[PDB]
């Protein structure tokens, strides 16, 4: 199962990237602190799962989340930010799921026991 | 599929039974407009669904939702309303959509469509 996290603050993704390799059989396979990283890094690789949070450079979490679940064979995705705003528009793009940090590890253990299932049943 | 609708206010109900009429082959086994004469309900009754606004007198819709959500066999939950603040929890809960009201006629019937698979898909 192939994931990006695209999360501007390091501590924020250096925490998430260990509970998805302690957690689960995902293979993070990149992250990204700028929003046109993804886009250019999105063009060339095809995932699975897609990890943001929304105030991020170039181009915000949302427009991208957005532009991506319009994709063939799209990634789940899956909303991680401390902003409650825009979870209307998570549920409109059909978001897989959206965890307001700070977030507790059950949480985020959880979340990633259910996505790897869904993925499973794809 | 048996499904019931939540609405304290009569034109948001008749719109909303309209469409299910309409454009499902769903039944509306009850409206309520009350979030008790709900609860009590569901003690002698079990739905395929739920449709339900948040402002709803005796007890709110968020804690129905959550209450049922922890049910055996449960409905699928749908927030049809015009508060935006609570779409974090319906993803907390696992709701099936929420949609703000006023609405487009397809933004119901798309999701009455994707309601109808996932419960056969079930």
């Given at each position: 199962?192939?994931?990006?996290i695209?999360?501007?603050?390091?501590l924020?993704?250096?925490?998430?990237?260990?509970?998805?390799?302690?957690?689960?059989?995902?293979?993070?396979?990149?992250?990204?602190?700028?929003g046109?990283?993804v886009?250019?890094?999105l063009?060339?690789?095809?995932?699975?799962?897609?990890?943001?949070?929304?105030n991020?450079?170039?181009?915000?979490?949302?427009?991208?989340?957005?532009n991506?679940?319009?994709?063939?064979?799209?990634?789940?995705?899956?909303?991680?930010?401390?902003?409650k705003?825009?979870?209307v528009?998570?549920?409109?793009?059909?978001?897989?799921?959206?965890?307001?940090?700070?977030?507790?590890?059950?949480?985020?253990?959880?979340?990633?026991?259910?996505?790897?299932?869904?993925?499973?049943?794809q």
């Amino acid at each position: 199962m192939k994931v990006i996290i695209v999360e501007d603050e390091f501590l924020a993704q250096q925490e998430l990237s260990w509970l998805i390799n302690t957690h689960s059989q995902m293979e993070i396979v990149g992250s990204f602190d700028d929003g046109l990283d993804v886009l250019k890094f999105l063009q060339h690789n095809k995932v699975d799962a897609i990890f943001l949070d929304i105030n991020i450079p170039s181009l915000d979490g949302v427009l991208l989340a957005q532009n991506i679940s319009q994709f063939a064979h799209k990634p789940f995705i899956v909303f991680i930010t401390a902003w409650k705003e825009h979870a209307v528009e998570a549920f409109e793009l059909e978001a897989f799921d959206y965890i307001l940090k700070p977030y507790q590890e059950s949480r985020i253990i959880n979340m990633l026991q259910k996505l790897t299932t869904a993925w499973e049943q794809q």
